[PDB]
């Protein structure tokens, strides 16, 4: 729950 | 401060005291325009103003030529923005060159000196400085 | 005129998502370099691992200052003015302003990054929440009808009577992942982390109050009583 | 402000380079699509009056007036960009430098000016950065670090921040950056 | 122990002293709240003192690290937060009682004879402690701090000749610094404290050599028993000890209220402006003093001249030291002097509030008009007190103290 | 003037305690070089405490700068290298002066009674005075 | 170990003057002086302001700035295994015969990280920086001939000005010291001879 | 006398 409400703004989409 | 290769209508910032100081070479035409301007000055003379014994009252340096102006807006203390150019769009016709604050809109001339019914309510300081050679200024000490 | 905002600093979801705004949108050009990490997630009820991977960007410790990498003489420079330390910002100006200052930026292209402000006339802080918010002008909306502080509602739905004025902030449809509800709960939030941020000690230092004043209320019995007896 | 419906029609001899939305395929190409309308202006007009230098470009814009380029922006500006793949080994440095700047040397994050999604501020004229080309990204850090590309102004904002960028960290930040959104 | 005692006293006059300054000691009986004060100047001076040592233990004056080291008190320091408070709070309400305490002085007329010397003492401790706040309020580095140091250090530059080198000579540099700042946590942290404490000293002397007032002005030791203790006279132990008791907890009630609860009080015991770090090239929009400065601030602001607007502000708090020689009344108490004088206290209490009121906000039309006209009602009180002290009649004192 | 200084003993006991202290309080006339240490320990005191106030309007009391900070009084306050002079040999000339004050009352006997009161406050005050030196 | 004495003569300018040169030249380089500023060693050694700035400040600073040095102390203190100590005050830390003789006893040993041992300062991690100017020492300490610019009295006396000028740098008040004393001391003696008369004429 | 006296160690040859 916490680390929902705290999740970065920005989204990397990686390799793989 | 050596001030001898500013081209003409363009300035330099030195660092003195912690505050930044507008050095400029002033040309003719500014120079022309700035007799024209005393009807919009609150402090046209620098009476209430804080400036050296030895700079002219009306053009406020040293030299007509060399304008050295701490670039600390009286009004709250902001730098003001150097804007040479005649007549720019927003700072309406009347605009003879000069420095426009842009925190709060308050207005100088080349001079330095306030615009009168601004924010800003005495004229931009003058520094104590003095011309050691005709292309170097020292900023800190009195001229003699 | 200011909007007033309730700021409920034992709202720990709020707290935690207002933190998560200020490390996301705000840290990148503002510190809020007199408060800890560690404080910060004990006093939110963050797991440290979680403050960790969830907070800090800047590679710091946990007990460290949320300290940035942008020098306040380089952001003058950069931006004009100085991005103020905005650990103690909402003791600065309060929440009322920070509340509607967030809410206020609306596109001026005359100045220097294309905003203005309305609480903060002329500021030299860009919009940075306009990803969020979406596109604010001055433009004409609907604005709750008023007469001399006679405010009209709807007697049916409860909802404002309105009519057209053109001097307000309206957000243009369709620019902002937010809407105007989610966007006020998001500055509000913000606003409530800040609210802490600038006052640590809030909740500790009514409950340790209320103790003192009791004591000192039995204390004061004691003390009269002994007075107006000895004083016969 | 410019015409989008015109500006497409405006575009097309650009698109040859930048893709018909602005989507560049090839890297070295930066992507138009989604950029800020008041950043392709300037940009355009920088390149114009050679204040930046393209020599892709030598002569495209001498052409086009003031209009034609804010009808251009505005339909690169009503595209979106698409979001490009960073490269795993690089990056964690890359998201770090971003997110976090460094503070030892003073080097800012780049999710104050360029938002954490990287969609910068369109209105304050930050790029959009996020699914960038990490080639064009990495060789405009480069551009500024030494000095190349000077066209962001009298405060050398990106000159400034590149400065503080090795090699190394430049092409993590990109990699990052081509993936960010 | 009786036995210890014996041998103390022997040693040392413990007992003499006790039974000389606190039992066996007869003060009038007929204190009411007005006479709480000066017991609680001495709680608030314990209390800043304590405080200050413990504050000094966790802050830097440096201009680097002084709002720093406040923040990491607030903070990181184990209820240091609570201590800052305490001291905060504690200069305001040092102010507060520090004020009542002389408002009582001018009700009863307690400065005139034979307590002049102590009247004279206490504007010095009330000097001393100005000085002190003042030298305070810069140590936290703040916006209000940097500023209003830097306006009350220019006032030197007014002084005609020597000014301006005085005002350089007293801020260590050409400008408000860490210099200054050092200079001043130096003065405010020792040198004045040593001097307040020899002050307060020196005040309780006197006062105990020539005897308290009272609220109705009558000279209790004129009246003695058999025993020679004063008719109206009780011991101040245990009688005294004990209603100062009582004040003592109202006080920390109100004091700890203020700790917990409100300890900015509305920006006035911790300005708003002064939470955000010393800026020395931006301004605050409206720069003020602390509240209790802010009567002196407005007589200043009132005068248009400057040179002048110092002076003034200057023989303001002057004029309080001629004060006992200015009262020309028969009688001590406000109760028994005539009209006049009861009319013109609260001419001096209105205008001493009005001032420190429109001291506190930014200049106005209606502010200015006010602050000029209570400047002068605020010097008149003082320069017309040898005229309307003469010219009212007086009631009979009684020869034995009401109640 | 004697006026003024009838008004001040009406109203302070300012005679009477220059009678009851200092003139007209008979001390032994055969006082030798061992009892000039009071009045020494004394003027030591005095400078310590004028000395560090002025050294503290430069110290800076932290780890980062505390050492610095005594480098810039020795260096850059004009005669602050005086003034930290004065106060650390005041220190050792503090110590030196009590020592010889503390053997002279262990010389003459002067702790005996009736003196217990004046030899405990000096080995107080030659605590604090250990305290405060270490500090 | 058995130092060599140094008659250190703070009075010589000139001597101080070439001690700066080789501090800022060869020692600034690791070591800082940062206790110092520019201004005040150009001013107690008579070196003009314009002089000071282009002979002796390298690192770009301001005359009236503090002789630091771009070499931090961690970073100096992985690369040589110990910190070089700031040396304004080395001369008081170690005192000048200590500095003669360290300067001087630079020899080398191959089993050391830098080549070189000191007989001062057995095991030191500093480099022998003076080696160009002194030549080749090694073990008694012998200079191999034909392998420094100068040689042993004209090493000896760059030494010696080196150490002056760290010696006037620890104790840059000693002149004024010793000026302001005579004088508190002739006032103290006048003062001394009144008080002795005043308690001699009150003792009657 | 003072400024060769101060002259730095490190010789620079410059084109020209
Ligand atoms: C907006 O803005 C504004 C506000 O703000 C926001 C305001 O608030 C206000 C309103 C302001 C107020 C009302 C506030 C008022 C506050 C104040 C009053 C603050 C003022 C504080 C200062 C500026 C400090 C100024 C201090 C001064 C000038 C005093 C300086 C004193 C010294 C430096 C002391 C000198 C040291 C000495 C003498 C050394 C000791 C000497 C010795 C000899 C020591 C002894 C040595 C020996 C014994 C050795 C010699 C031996 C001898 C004698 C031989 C014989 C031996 C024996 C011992 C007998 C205004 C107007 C305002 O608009
Ligand atoms: C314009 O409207 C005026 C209204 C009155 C006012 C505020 C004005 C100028 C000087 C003020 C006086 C200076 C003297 O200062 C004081 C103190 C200093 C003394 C030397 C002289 O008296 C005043 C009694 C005197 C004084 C404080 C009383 C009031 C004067 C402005
Ligand atoms: C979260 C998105 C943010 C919040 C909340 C605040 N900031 Fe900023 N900001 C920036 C600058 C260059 C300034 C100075 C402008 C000026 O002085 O004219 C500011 C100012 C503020 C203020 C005003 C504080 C005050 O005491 O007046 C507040 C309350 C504030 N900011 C809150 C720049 C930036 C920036 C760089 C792009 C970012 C990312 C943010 N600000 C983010 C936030
Ligand atoms: C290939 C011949 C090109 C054509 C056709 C156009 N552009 Fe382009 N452009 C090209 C390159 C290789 C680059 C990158 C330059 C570099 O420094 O690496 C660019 C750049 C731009 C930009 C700047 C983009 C940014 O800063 O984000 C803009 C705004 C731009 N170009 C606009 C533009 C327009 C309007 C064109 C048609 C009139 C156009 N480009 C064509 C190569 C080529
Ligand atoms: C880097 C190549 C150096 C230069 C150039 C100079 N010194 Fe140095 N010094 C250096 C280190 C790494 C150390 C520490 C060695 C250790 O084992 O601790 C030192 C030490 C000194 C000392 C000793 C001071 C003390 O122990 O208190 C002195 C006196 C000293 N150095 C003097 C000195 C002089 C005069 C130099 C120029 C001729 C000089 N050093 C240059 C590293 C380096
Ligand atoms: C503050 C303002 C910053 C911050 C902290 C960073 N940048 Fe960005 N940047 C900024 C401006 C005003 C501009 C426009 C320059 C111009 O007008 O010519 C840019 C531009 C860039 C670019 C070029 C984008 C493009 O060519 O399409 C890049 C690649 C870029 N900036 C990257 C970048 C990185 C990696 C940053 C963190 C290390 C960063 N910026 C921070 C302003 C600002
Ligand atoms: C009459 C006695 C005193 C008064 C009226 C007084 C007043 C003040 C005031 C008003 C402040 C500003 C606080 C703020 O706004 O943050 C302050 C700060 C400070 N004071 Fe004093 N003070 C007194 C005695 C002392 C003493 C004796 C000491 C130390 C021995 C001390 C140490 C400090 C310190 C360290 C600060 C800075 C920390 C802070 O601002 O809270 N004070 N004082
Ligand atoms: C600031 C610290 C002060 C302390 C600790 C202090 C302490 C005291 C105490 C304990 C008393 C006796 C009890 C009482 O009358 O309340 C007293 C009396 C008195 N004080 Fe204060 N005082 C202070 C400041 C002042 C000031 C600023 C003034 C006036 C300018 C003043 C003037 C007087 C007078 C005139 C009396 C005796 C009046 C009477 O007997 O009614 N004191 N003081
Ligand atoms: C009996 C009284 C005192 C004694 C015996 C004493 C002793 C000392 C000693 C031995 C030092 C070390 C000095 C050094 O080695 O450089 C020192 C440092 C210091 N003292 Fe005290 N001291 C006393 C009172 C005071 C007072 C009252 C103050 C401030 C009001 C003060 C302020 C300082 C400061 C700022 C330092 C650090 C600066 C320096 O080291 O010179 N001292 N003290
Ligand atoms: S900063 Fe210039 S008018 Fe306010």
């Known amino acids: 729950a916490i680390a929902k409400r705290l999740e970065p703004v920005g989204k990397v989409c990686v390799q793989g | 401060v050596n001030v001898g290769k500013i081209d003409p209508g363009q300035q330099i910032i030195a660092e003195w005291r912690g505050k930044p100081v507008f050095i400029v070479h002033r040309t003719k035409e500014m120079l022309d325009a700035l007799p024209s301007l005393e009807g919009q000055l609150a402090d046209p003379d620098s009476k209430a103003s804080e400036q050296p014994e030895y700079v002219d009252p009306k053009l406020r340096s040293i030299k007509p030529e060399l304008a050295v102006i701490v670039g600390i807006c009286t009004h709250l203390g902001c730098s003001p923005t150097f804007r040479p150019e005649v007549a720019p769009a927003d700072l309406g016709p009347d605009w003879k060159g000069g420095y426009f604050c842009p925190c709060h809109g308050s207005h100088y001339d080349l001079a330095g000196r306030v615009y009168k019914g601004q924010p800003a309510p005495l004229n931009l300081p003058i520094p104590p400085y003095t011309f050691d050679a005709d292309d170097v200024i020292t900023i800190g000490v009195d001229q003699e | 005129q200011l909007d007033h905002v309730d700021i409920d600093l034992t709202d720990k979801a709020a707290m935690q998502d207002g933190a998560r705004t200020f490390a996301n949108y705000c840290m990148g050009c503002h510190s809020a370099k007199f408060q800890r990490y560690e404080r910060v997630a004990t006093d939110l009820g963050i797991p440290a691992d979680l403050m960790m991977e969830k907070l800090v960007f800047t590679g710091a410790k946990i007990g460290d200052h949320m300290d940035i990498g942008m020098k306040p003489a380089d952001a003058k420079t950069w931006f004009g003015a100085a991005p103020p330390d905005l650990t103690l910002v909402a003791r600065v100006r309060g929440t009322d302003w920070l509340y509607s200052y967030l809410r206020s930026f609306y596109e001026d292209p005359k100045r220097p990054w294309g905003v203005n402000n309305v609480i903060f006339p002329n500021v030299g802080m860009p919009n940075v929440l306009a990803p969020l918010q979406g596109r604010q002008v001055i433009g004409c909306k609907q604005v709750q009808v008023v007469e001399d502080g006679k405010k009209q509602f709807d007697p049916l739905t409860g909802t404002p009577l309105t009519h057209e004025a053109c001097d307000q902030l309206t957000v243009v449809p369709k620019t902002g992942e937010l809407n105007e509800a989610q966007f006020d709960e998001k500055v509000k939030n913000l606003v409530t982390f800040l609210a802490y941020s600038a006052n640590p000690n809030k909740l500790a230092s009514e409950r340790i109050g209320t103790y003192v004043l009791l004591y000192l209320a039995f204390f004061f019995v004691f003390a009269y009583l002994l007075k107006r007896e000895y004083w016969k | ?180 959104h | ?315 303001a708090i002057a004029v309080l030291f001629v004060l006992p020689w200015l009262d020309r009344s028969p009688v001590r108490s406000i109760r028994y002097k005539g009209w006049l004088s009861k009319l013109w206290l609260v001419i001096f209490a209105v205008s001493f509030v009005i001032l420190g009121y429109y001291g506190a906000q930014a200049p106005s039309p209606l502010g200015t008009t006010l602050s000029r006209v209570c400047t002068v009602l605020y010097f008149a009180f003082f320069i017309l007190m040898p005229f309307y002290t003469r010219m009212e009649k007086t009631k009979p004192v009684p020869e034995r103290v009401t109640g």
Request: proline letters at 5%; aromatic letters at 14%; charged letters at 15%.
């Open chain 4, 1 to 180: 402000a410019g015409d989008a419906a015109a500006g497409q029609a405006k575009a097309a001899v650009c698109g040859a380079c930048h893709g018909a939305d602005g989507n560049s395929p090839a890297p070295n190409f930066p992507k138009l699509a989604g950029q800020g309308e008041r950043y392709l202006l300037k940009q355009m007009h920088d390149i114009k009056d050679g204040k930046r230098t393209v020599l892709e470009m030598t002569g495209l814009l001498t052409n086009l007036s003031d209009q034609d380029l804010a009808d251009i922006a505005a339909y690169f500006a009503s595209q979106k960009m698409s979001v490009g793949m960073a490269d795993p080994n690089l990056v964690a440095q890359g998201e770090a430098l971003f997110r976090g700047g460094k503070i030892a040397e003073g080097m800012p994050a780049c999710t104050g000016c360029h938002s954490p999604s990287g969609v910068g501020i369109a209105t304050a004229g930050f790029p959009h950065l996020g699914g960038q080309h990490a080639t064009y990204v990495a060789k405009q850090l480069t551009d500024f670090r030494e000095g190349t590309r000077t066209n962001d102004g009298d405060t050398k904002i990106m000159q400034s921040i590149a400065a503080k960028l090795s090699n190394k960290d430049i092409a993590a930040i990109s990699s990052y950056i081509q993936g960010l």
């Open chain 5, 1 to 315: 122990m009786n036995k210890f005692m014996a041998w103390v006293d022997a040693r040392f006059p413990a007992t003499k002293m006790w039974e000389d300054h606190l039992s066996k000691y007869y003060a009038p009986k007929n204190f009411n709240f007005w006479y709480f004060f000066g017991s609680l100047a001495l709680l608030v001076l314990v209390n800043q003192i304590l405080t200050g040592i413990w504050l000094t233990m966790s802050f830097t004056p440096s201009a680097e690290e002084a709002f720093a080291s406040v923040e990491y008190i607030m903070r990181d320091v184990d209820y240091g937060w609570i201590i800052r408070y305490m001291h905060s709070t504690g200069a305001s309400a040092f102010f507060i009682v520090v004020y009542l305490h002389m408002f009582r002085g001018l009700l009863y007329g307690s400065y005139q004879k034979p307590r002049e010397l102590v009247w004279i003492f206490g504007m010095l401790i009330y000097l001393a402690l100005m000085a002190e706040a003042f030298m305070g309020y810069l140590l936290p580095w703040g916006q209000m701090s940097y500023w209003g140091a830097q306006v009350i250090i220019s006032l030197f530059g007014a002084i005609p000749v020597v000014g301006e080198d005085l005002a350089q000579w007293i801020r260590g540099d050409f400008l408000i610094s860490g210099i200054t700042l050092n200079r001043f946590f130096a003065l405010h942290v020792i040198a004045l404290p040593i001097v307040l404490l020899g002050l307060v000293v020196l005040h309780i002397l006197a006062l105990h050599e020539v005897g308290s007032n009272n609220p109705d002005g009558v000279d209790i030791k004129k009246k003695k028993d058999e025993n020679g203790v004063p008719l109206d006279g009780i011991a101040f132990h245990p009688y005294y000890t004990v209603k100062d008791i009582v004040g003592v907890v109202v006080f920390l009630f109100i004091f700890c209220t203020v700790i917990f609860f409100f300890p900015e009080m509305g920006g006035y015991f911790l300005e708003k402006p002064n939470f955000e770090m010393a800026n020395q090239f931006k301004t605050p929009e409206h720069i003020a003093p602390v509240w209790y400065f802010t009567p002196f601030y407005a007589i200043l602001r009132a005068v248009p001249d400057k040179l002048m607007g110092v002076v003034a502000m200057g023989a």
